């Protein structure tokens, strides 16, 4: 899924 959060943390 390319629309999933790609980071370690939320913003």
């Amino acid at each position, epitope marked *: 899924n*390319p*629309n999933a*959060n*790609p*980071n*370690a943390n939320p913003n």
Partner: antibody
Amino acid sequence: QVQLVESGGGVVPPGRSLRLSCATSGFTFSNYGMHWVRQAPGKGLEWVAIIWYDGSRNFYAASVEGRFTISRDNSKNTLYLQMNSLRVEDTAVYYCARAAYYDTSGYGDYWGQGTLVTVSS
Amino acid sequence: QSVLTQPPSVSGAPGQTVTISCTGGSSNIGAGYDVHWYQQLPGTAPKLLIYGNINRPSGVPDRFSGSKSGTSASLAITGLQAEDEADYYCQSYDRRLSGSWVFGGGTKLTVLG
């Protein structure tokens, strides 16, 4: 402060390869995914590729799938884009962008200055 | 053509208000995927202008605002200043494509001098 700096652009003929770099500073590189965006001269923006913060997933646009390879070197806080079998329509400024996310989609909160790639015979 | 449709150009005089639309479909904006906006000054890289449909980065003046309804989103700029002259892009995600982002065609804003 968040800072992205692209490098590696130049002028090559079709079929040639090229590697773009994006050195970052001012934040923990290993905690963020990274994007590549390109913009042909006088045209609009086109999303190219993404790499997960942990380098576990890579996604590409259909126009580059199989030819471009995105990678990262967390030890050097640097992002890379390996471009193979370059076509003339790959001519564009290439931008480095840091991944961000809201509720149902992502965006880029910081961008680099860009590097020019010219594919011409 | 761009998956998200923008007008190629809009113009306004100093002090006026202008709006820039971003029309999508049932597979992107219509599906609830967040919309974001970028400002690209002449000869410069894009900069984030609006995120999460309606939110301004703390560095963006309060003259810029965004909204969305149904399958369309809109960027509004009040009290136009000559410094606002730039290209504006909307951005979201589309369920039919293999990419994380999808862009609009962009809109060139001219501040009448």
